Design goal:
Two copies of one chain form a homodimer. Chain A is built from five helices and two strands. By secondary structure, chain A is mainly alpha-helical. Chains A, B: It holds the Pfam family HTH_3.
């Protein structure tokens, strides 16, 4: 449903999940799970990622009718 | 935290909460709760709205540092 480009984007950012998770105010492991597509982040977390990376949320987490 | 423009945006679309709720696959009451900002919709729900309303998710649900 939702495709997570956070890791792909994060690599562009060259930001560690360590700091990004901090922006989110979640554990680094939380990002890794998100990167490793274990689960998709909540809207608040997604938005925080979008806001903190000032990147479009959809670009990071796109919902596809797939 | 997150400001919901769904009601503001949806009405621009001319889409009923009911159809959108259907688009989301949730009840109208749920959307009305979302629209009346009782609670913020999940990431999947928000993204579906973004797709359905052909509008950016953040634009509908903006996460503010407030």
């Amino acid at each position: 449903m939702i495709i997570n480009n956070l890791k792909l984007i994060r690599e562009k950012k060259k930001i560690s999940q360590s700091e990004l998770a901090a922006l989110l105010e979640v554990s680094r492991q939380t990002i890794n799970g998100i990167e490793k597509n274990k689960y998709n982040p909540s809207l608040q977390l997604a938005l925080k990622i979008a806001y903190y990376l000032n990147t479009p949320l959809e670009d990071i987490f796109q919902w596809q009718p797939e």
